[PDB]
Amino acid sequence: RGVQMLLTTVGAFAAFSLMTIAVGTDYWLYSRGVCEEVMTHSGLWRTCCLEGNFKGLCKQIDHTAEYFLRAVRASSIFPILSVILLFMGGLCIAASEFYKTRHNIILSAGIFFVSAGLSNIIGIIVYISANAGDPSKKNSYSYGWSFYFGALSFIIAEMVGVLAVHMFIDRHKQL
Amino acid sequence: DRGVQMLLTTVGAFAAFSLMTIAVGTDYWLYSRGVCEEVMTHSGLWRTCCLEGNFKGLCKQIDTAEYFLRAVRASSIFPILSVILLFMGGLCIAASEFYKTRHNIILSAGIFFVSAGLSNIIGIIVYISANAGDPSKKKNSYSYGWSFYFGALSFIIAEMVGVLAVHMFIDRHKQL
Amino acid sequence: RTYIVTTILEDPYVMLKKNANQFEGNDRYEGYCVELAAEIAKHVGYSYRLEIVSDGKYGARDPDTKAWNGMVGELVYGRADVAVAPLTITLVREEVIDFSKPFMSLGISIMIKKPQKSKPGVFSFLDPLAYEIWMCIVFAYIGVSVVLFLVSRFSRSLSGRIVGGVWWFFTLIIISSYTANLAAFLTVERMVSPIESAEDLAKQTEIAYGTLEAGSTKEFFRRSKIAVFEKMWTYMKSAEPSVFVRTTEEGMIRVRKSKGKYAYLLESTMNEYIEQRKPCDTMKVGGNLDSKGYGIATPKGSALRNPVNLAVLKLNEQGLLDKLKNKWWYDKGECGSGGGDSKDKTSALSLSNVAGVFYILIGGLGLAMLVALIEFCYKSR
Amino acid sequence: VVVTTIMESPYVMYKKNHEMFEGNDKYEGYCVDLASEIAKHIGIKYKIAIVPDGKYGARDADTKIWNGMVGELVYGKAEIAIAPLTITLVREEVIDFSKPFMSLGISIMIKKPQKSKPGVFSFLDPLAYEIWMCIVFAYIGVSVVLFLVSRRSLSGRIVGGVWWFFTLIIISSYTANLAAFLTVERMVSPIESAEDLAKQTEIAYGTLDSGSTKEFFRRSKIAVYEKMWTYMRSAEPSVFTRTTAEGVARVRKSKGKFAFLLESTMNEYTEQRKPCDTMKVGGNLDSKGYGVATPKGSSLRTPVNLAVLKLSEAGVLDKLKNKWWYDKGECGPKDSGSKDKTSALSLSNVAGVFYILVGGLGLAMLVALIEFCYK
Amino acid sequence: VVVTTIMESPYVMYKKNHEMFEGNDKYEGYCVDLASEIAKHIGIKYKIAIVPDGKYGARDADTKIWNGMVGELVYGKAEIAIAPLTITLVREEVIDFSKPFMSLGISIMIKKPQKSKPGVFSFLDPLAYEIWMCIVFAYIGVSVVLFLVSRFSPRSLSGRIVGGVWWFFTLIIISSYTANLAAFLTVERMVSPIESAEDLAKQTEIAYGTLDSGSTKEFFRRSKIAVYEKMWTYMRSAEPSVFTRTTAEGVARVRKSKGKFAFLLESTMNEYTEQRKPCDTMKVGGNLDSKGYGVATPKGSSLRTPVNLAVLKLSEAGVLDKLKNKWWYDKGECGPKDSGSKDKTSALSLSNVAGVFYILVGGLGLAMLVALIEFCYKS
Amino acid sequence: RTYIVTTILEDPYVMLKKNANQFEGNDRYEGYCVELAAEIAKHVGYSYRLEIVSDGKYGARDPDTKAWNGMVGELVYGRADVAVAPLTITLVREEVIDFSKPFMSLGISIMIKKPQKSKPGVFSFLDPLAYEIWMCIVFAYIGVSVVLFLVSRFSLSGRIVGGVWWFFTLIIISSYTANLAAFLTVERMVSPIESAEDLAKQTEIAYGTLEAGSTKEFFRRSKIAVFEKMWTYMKSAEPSVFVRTTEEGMIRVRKSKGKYAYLLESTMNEYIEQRKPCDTMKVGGNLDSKGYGIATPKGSALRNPVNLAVLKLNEQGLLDKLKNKWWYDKGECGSGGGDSKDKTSALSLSNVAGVFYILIGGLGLAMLVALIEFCYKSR
Ligand SMILES: O=c1[nH]c2cc(C(F)(F)F)c(N3CCOCC3)cc2n(CP(=O)(O)O)c1=O
Ligand SMILES: O=c1[nH]c2cc(C(F)(F)F)c(N3CCOCC3)cc2n(CP(=O)(O)O)c1=O
Ligand SMILES: O=c1[nH]c2cc(C(F)(F)F)c(N3CCOCC3)cc2n(CP(=O)(O)O)c1=O
Ligand SMILES: O=c1[nH]c2cc(C(F)(F)F)c(N3CCOCC3)cc2n(CP(=O)(O)O)c1=O
C-alpha cells in the first residue's frame, strides 16, 4: 500500500540525486591521451589533467547519418531531454502524492519513467558509439564507475516505473 | 469415402509388394563408371555386370563403428526386413478384410507399415553411406538409377497407407 | 629530290586499305607509323614515298656471314635514309647505326586468361550440401512428421518430448553444418587473388608460363642475373611438356583453347592489341619487366639526323603521339570500348546466387494456397 | 674529368661520416654509383662536383641565359651531366642528350586506405539492399497469406515450415558472408585507381605551382585533361602547393585530401620511406625519360651513349634501382604483404541493430499510446 | 687413370636410350658430376669403368675373396673409386677411406594419408568428448529443477529466468560448435599418427620390416639400446612376412597400403623416393644412426692425399650441397608444389553427417516402441 | 712411455667437479670427451694424461703474423701427442694435420621460444566480443522485458516487439558466430617456422648469428639462393646481430618473447635443449653437413690406431649410447624424457567453461528465487 508509495518516492529522489551527481563532475572516462601516454580524466564538456607538468591547466572540449550522430554527440540533446523528462516525472509523482483525486497521473508517470529509461539507453549507446568511433591508429578504454551508477539510475528508474504500473493496476482494481 | 478407402489401402499394399519385388530384382542399382579405363557399368548387389565392353557376359558381385556397417551392408538385411514387414502388414490387412470383428489387427498393420518405412529408410541411408565412401579417387559419379526412385515411392505409399490406416482405425474404434 | 622509307607490316602499322588495289599505291596506308611518318615529313619537309621491305624481317646480327637483313639491313647497305617501322634496340643496332629518341615507353607484360562469372539459379541453393542429403533430410522431415502424427493421434506425453528434442538437435546440427560449409566456400573463393607482377608468378607453380625461342625475351631471361629472373629461368629449363612455341598465333590459340593457366610474356604493344581484339579472352596485369624502347633509324653523316631528332622530340612534347596511340589503339578497337565495365567490385552475396531459396519459397506458398483453396472448396461442398 | 650533380633525395646522399674523405667517395646512392659504373665501362679519371645554382636548368626567355647543369655545360664549365634530367624540346637545340635509361610518367598516389568505421553502413556491409527489401516483401507476403488462411491445419504447418526454412537459409547465408568478411579483412583500393576513375570522382586533387606538370597542363587537346584543368581551376585556391612538403603535410591529414598528380620517381621513393603509410601507385600517365648530356663537338658523346645503352641492355641500372629503391627500405611490408590482428568487434560494427531495436520499442510504446487514445 | 662406380644406384643413369653423347661424358647424375668436379680440381684423368659384380662389395669368410668396388680396389684394377660406400670396420682394416661428403641414417617410411571418412567418430570429432555429456547432464538438471519448481509452486519469474538461461546456453553452444566446424572446414592441418621412433615403438599398431638381409638388418640384430631391443622383439613376432626381399618390393607394398607394412631404409633412398612419380611419401625426420659415403684408394699413395684434400675443400665450399640440392630437388616434380593446395573445396558428403541421421532414426524408433509398450502396459 | 691429451673447459663436454681438490689426478673431469678418451685408451692401449690449453680458446689456422693458437698450433709446435676435443673440420686445419673420422654430425639450428598460451576461464567467454557489448545486450534484455511487461499489463504491439527482438537476437547470434569462427580459423592457419625458406619468406622475426666464426664465414661465402637472400636481408642490419657471445644471445632471445632468433650449432642447441629450462626447441633439419675429429700428427705412429679405434667405437654404437645417456639422463627438462603434447585440434573444456559456470549460476539464482516464491507462498 503506502509502503510501496514511500519506496517509489525515495527511489525517485535517489534517482534525481544520482542524476545530478552524474551530470555534475566530469569524471566519466579515463584515457591515456595527451595533455606521450599521459593519464587524463574526460567528461562531457571539459577535460583536465590529473598528473603531469600541466597540473591545474584545464581546457574546454567539444564533440548524412554520421553527421547526425556526431551532431547529437556534440550537442548532447539526449541527456538534456532525459533529465527534463525525469524532472517532469518527479513533478507528476509529487502531484499524485499531493492530489489523490487524479487517476491517469499514475499511468502518465509510469510512461514518463519508461521513456526516461528509453532516453537513458539511447544516450548511453550513442555515447559509447561516439567515444569508440575514433580508433585512430592498451588501457584507453577505462571507466570511473560513472556509467556504473548510470546503470544504477537506469535500473532504479525501471523499478519505479514497473511499480507505478503495478499500482495503477491495483488502484484501477480498487475503483 | 470408406469402401473406396479400403480399395485404396489394398491397392497401395499391392503396389508396395510390386515395388519391393522390383527393388530386390533390380540389377541396375546405380550407374557407376569404372573397369570390368572408366566405362559405364550396371552395379548390382547380387550381380554387378557390364553392358559395354569386351568382357560382357561374365561378371561378379561387389563382395567397431565400421565393422558392423560393412557387415550389415554385405549381408543386406534391409531388403529382408522390408519384405518381411511388408508381408506381415499385407497379411494383416488381408485378414482384416476377411474377418472384420477384430479391431486391433488394423492398428497392428499400421505398426508394421511404419516399421517397414523404418526398415527401408535405414536401408536407404546405410546403402548411400556405404557406396558414397570412396575417397581414393572419378570425375563423374552418382547419376542414380530408378531403383532409388522406386524405393522412395514404396516409402511414401507405405507412410500414406500407414497414416490412413491409423486414422480410420481410430475412427472405426470410435463409432464402435 | 625524293626519299624512300622502309616499313614492315605485321600489326597494326602498315595494314592495307579497305579498297586494296583500287587506290594509287602509296596513298593506301593507314596505321601508327605511316601517320607518324606523314607528320614528321610535314614538320621539316621531304618526300615521304613508301618502299617495300624485301624479306619481311626486322633484322638481326649475323657475325658468321657478316651480312645484314631487315630494315636495318636495308639502311646500312645504302639506298635508305629513314626506317619508320618500329624496332627493338640491341647493342649491334647501335654499333652499326644510330637511333635518335624512343617515341614510346614499353616492356614485357605478364598476362592471364580472363575468368567469367556465371552465377547459377537454384543449383547454388542446394550446392553447399552435395546432392543426396537434401533428399535425406526431405524424407527425414516426413518421417518425423509421420511419427509426430501417429503419437498425437494414438495417445504432453513423454514420448512426444524426446522426439521433439531429437528433431531439434537434428535441425541445429545440420544447419550448423550448412553454415560452416557455406562459410568454407565463401572464404576459399575469397582469399584467393589474381596473379600480379613477376615474383607472385614465381611462387606460383601450377599456373605455368613460357616464351618463344626465336625472340629477345628468351635471350633476356637467359642472360639475366636477377634472382627472381634466375628462378624464372631455372624453372623454365625444367620443362617436361611442350611449353615452347614457334610463332605467336599458335601459342595464343593454344592459350585460348585452355584459358585456365598460362602466361606467355610477350611485348606490351602486341598484348594491348590482343586486349583490344574481339576474342576478349585475357586481362593484363602488372608492369613492365624491362625498359626496352623503340626509335627511328638514320645513317651516319646524313643531313636528316638532327631534323628527325627535333621532329620526334616535338611529337613527344606535343602529345600527338599519345593522340595517335589513343586513336589507333582504343577508338578503332572493337572490344573493350568501355574499359570500366566492371569496377564496382561489390563482393557480397547478391540476388544472383541466393535466389534459389526465394524460388522454392514462392513454390511452397503456391502449393500452400492451392491446398488452402482445396480445403475451402471441400468445406463449401 | 669533372661532372656536375644536383642534390636530390632519390639519387645522392651526404655520407654519415662526413669527415671520412672530401672528394670522390663522399656521396652514395644511385647517381654516383651509375657514374662509377660508366667510368669503369669507358675508362677515365672522374671527380665529383656540385652546381652552385640549385636549379635544374630552364630558359628564362627574357635575358637569354641558361642556368643549372645545362647552363654550366653550355657556358664551358662542365662536360658530363650524370644528374638525371627530363628531355624537353627547348633543351635540345642548346644541349645534346643521350638515350634515356629510366622510364617515368605522371602517376597517382593516395593516402593510406584504412578500415571503414561507419555507424549504420557497418550492419549494411553483408548482403545488400535488394535482398533485404525482398525479405520485407517475403515477410509481408507471409503476413497476408496467413491472414488469408486464418479466415492445426495442413496449410498452417506447411507455411510455418517453409517460413522457418526460408529464414534459416537467410541466417546461414548472412552468417557465412559475415564470417568470410571478418576472416579475410581484404582491403579494397579506393575510387582513384585510373585516369577516368580519377576524373569523375569528387576527391580534390593538387599539384605543384610550376614545373613539368604545370607545363604539360598549360596546353591540352585530349578533352579529359581539359576536364581535369577545369576541376582544378574551379576548386579552392589551396590546390596549388609552393613546396611538396606542404602538399604531403596536407595529404597526410585527410583521408580524401588533396591527392598529388606527379611523376613516378618520388612515388616509388616515398612508397618505401621512413613513414610507411602510403604505398599506392595506381595507374601510369604520359611518358618521359632521364638521360645524360654532352655539349657539341665532343667525341665522348658516342662512347657514353654506347656505355649507357650497353649497361641498360645487359642490366646494371635495374640492379642498382632494385637494390637502392626496394631493398633499401625502412619497412618490409611494402614489398610483401603481411597480416594484422583481427581484434575485438567493438560496437561500431554492430551499432546498427541497437538503434533499430530501441526505435522499434519506442514506436511500439507510441502506437500503444495511440491505441489507448483512440479506443 | 681408371675410375669406377656402380650402375645400380640412384646416382647414375644412361642418357636417353642409345647413342646419346657416346663416350666418357655419356652418363649424368650426382656421382659422375661429383667425380668430374673432384677431377677438375687436382687434375686427374677422368674416365669410366662401371664394371658390375652383382653386389656392392662384401667379404665372405670361407671364400676370403672380396667383391664389388672394394674387391676391385683390393686386388687392383683402378686407383680412384667413387661409389656409395657405408664405411665400416671390415672394409677399413683392408683399405683406407676419405672424409664422407654427406650424412646418413636409417629413417622410417610411412605412406602419407590423404583424408579420413569415419562414421560416429566424424560426428564426435569437433568440439570435444566430455562436453557432450556435460550438456546432457546440464539438460537433466534443468529438466528436474523445472519440474520441482512447477510441483512446489505452479511460470512467474523463475520460469522466465530458467528459460532465458537455457536459451543463452543453446545459443552459445551452437555458436561454439559452428565456429569450430567452420574453422575445421576452411583450412586443415595434417600431423599424422606417427611422430618419432620412440612413439613408433610405443604405438604397436603398424607393422615394421627392415629388410631380409643388409646393413639395416645387421644393425637391428646387433643393436644394444633398449628401444631397439623392443623393436627387435617386435621383429621376432613377424607373422605377415615383413621380411622384404628387395627395396622396390617394400616401397611398392607401402605405396598400395598405408595402414601397415612400414619400411625401414636410409635417408638417401627415402629422400629419393620422396621425389618419385607416385608422389605419396612421408618421413618424420631424425636419423637412428650416423654413417657417410666416402671414396677409397688402394692402400696409401700420392692420390690418397690429393683426393682427400680435394673432397674436403669441396665439402667446405658450397658445391657439393649445390649438386645435391639441384639434382634431387629438380628431377623430382612432386616437391615443386610445396606446402599444400588450397583449391580443394569438395562438399559435406553423407559419411561424415550420417551419424546424426542414425541417431535421429533410432531415437524415433525406440520412442515409438517405448510409447506403445507403456500404453499397452500402464492401462 | 706416457702420452698427453688436451681438452678445453666446455659445458657440454667437461664437468667442473664440485668436490674438485679432494679427487685430483686423472679423475678430475667427467663427460663426453674424457669418456671417449678413456674408451679409446682402453681400446688401443696406452697411458693418457689430461692437459689444459693455455689460451683457453679453440684457435684457428688463419695465416696471420705467426703465433698460431689452439690445439692445431699446440700440436704442430711438437709438444703434443693426441688432441681429443670438439673440433670443426676445415681445410686450413687439414693442411698440416689429419683427422681420424667424423664421430658426430653438426648442423645449424634456429632458436624459437616456446609458445605457451594458458587458456583462461570466464575471460575467454567474453573474449570474442566487447564488455560494453555485453552491457548493451543485458540492457536490451531488460528493455525488451519491461516493454513486454507493460504491453501485457496494459491490454499488435506485443507481436511487433517479439518480432523486433527475434530480429535483434538473430543478428547478435549471427555476428557472434561469425566473429568466433574468424578468430578460431585465424588461430588455426598459423604457420610454425621450419627450415630456412620459411624464415626467408616470413620476414617478421629477426635472426642473427655471431659476428665471426664458421657461421659468419658460411653467411659471407653463401651461394644458396635462399641463403643468399637471407644473407642480404641480414646485411641491412637494422637491428644488427645485437649479440656478443652465446649466453648473451640466448638471454636476448629469451627476453625477446619469441621475436628474435639465433643460428647456432645443432650440438649446442641439443645440449641447451634439456640443460636449460624448457623454453626453446629444435625444428627443421641441418642447414649444412659437417663433422668432428681427433687431431693426430701427420708423421707419427699414433695415426692409424686412433682412426681404427674411433671408427670401431662409432660402428659398435657405444658412442651413441654414451651420448644419449649423457644428454638425456642428466637433463633438467621433460620435453624428451616424458610424453609431449598431441595436436588433436578441437577444444578441451577451456573457453566454454566460463559459460557453463554462468549457466550453473543462473540455475542457482532461478532456484533460489523459486525458493523465495515458495516461502512467500508459506507466508
Ligand atoms: O626489333 C624488333 N621488334 C619487334 C617487335 C615486335 C612487336 F611486338 F610485334 F612489335 C615483335 N613481336 C614480339 C611478339 O611476338 C611477335 C613479334 C618482335 C620484334 N623483334 C623480334 P624479338 O623482340 O627478338 O622477338 C625485333 O627484333
Ligand atoms: O629532367 C628533369 N628531371 C627532373 C626530375 C625530378 C625528380 F623527380 F626529382 F627526380 C624533378 N623534381 C620535381 C619535383 O621537385 C624536385 C625535382 C625535376 C626534374 N626536372 C625539372 P621539372 O621541370 O620541375 O620536372 C627536370 O627537368
Ligand atoms: O657401398 C655401398 N653403398 C650403398 C649405397 C646405398 C644407397 F646410397 F642408399 F643407395 C645403399 N642402399 C641401401 C638401401 O637400399 C638401397 C641401396 C646400399 C649401399 N651398399 C649396400 P648396404 O650394405 O645394404 O649398405 C653398399 O655396400
Ligand atoms: O673448430 C671449431 N670448433 C667449434 C666448436 C664449437 C662447439 F661445438 F659449439 F662447441 C663452437 N661453438 C659455436 C657456438 O658457440 C659456442 C662455440 C665453435 C667452434 N669453432 C669456432 P666457429 O668458427 O665459431 O664455429 C671452431 O673453430
Numbering used by the authors:
A (entry chain H): 6 to 40, 55 to 82, 93 to 166, 171 to 208
B (entry chain F): 5 to 40, 55 to 81, 93 to 166, 170 to 208
C (entry chain A): 389 to 543, 590 to 815
D (entry chain D): 397 to 547, 596 to 819
E (entry chain B): 397 to 550, 596 to 820
F (entry chain C): 389 to 543, 592 to 815
Task: Quote the paper.
AMPARs are tetrameric assemblies composed of subunits GluA1 to GluA4 and exhibit a modular architecture comprising three layers: the extracellular N-terminal domain (ATD), the extracellular ligand-binding domain (LBD) and the transmembrane domain (TMD). Here, to determine the subunit composition, physiological architecture and gating mechanisms of CP-AMPARs, we visualize these receptors, immunoaffinity purified from rat cerebella, and resolve their structures using cryo-electron microscopy (cryo-EM). Our results indicate that the predominant assembly consists of GluA1 and GluA4 subunits, with the GluA4 subunit occupying the B and D positions, and auxiliary subunits, including transmembrane AMPAR regulatory proteins (TARPs) located at the B′ and D′ positions, and cornichon homologues (CNIHs) or TARPs located at the A′ and C′ positions.
To elucidate the architecture and subunit arrangement of CP-AMPARs, we characterized the structure of cerebellar GluA1-containing CP-AMPARs in the presence of MPQX, a competitive antagonist that stabilizes receptors in a resting, non-desensitized state. One class shows two auxiliary proteins at B′ and D′ positions with a distinctive extracellular protrusion, with no discernible density features at the A′ or C′ positions. Notably, the absence of auxiliary proteins at the A′ and C′ positions is correlated with weak density for the receptor M2 helices, consistent with previous studies showing that fully occupied auxiliary subunits stabilize M2 helices. We infer that the TARP subunits are largely contributed by γ2 on the basis of the western blot and mass spectrometry results. Overall, we observed that 65% of particles contain 2 TARPs at B′ and D′ positions, 17% contain 2 TARPs at the B′ and D′ positions and 2 CNIHs at the A′ and C′ positions, and 18% contain 4 TARPs at the A′, B′, C′ and D′ positions.
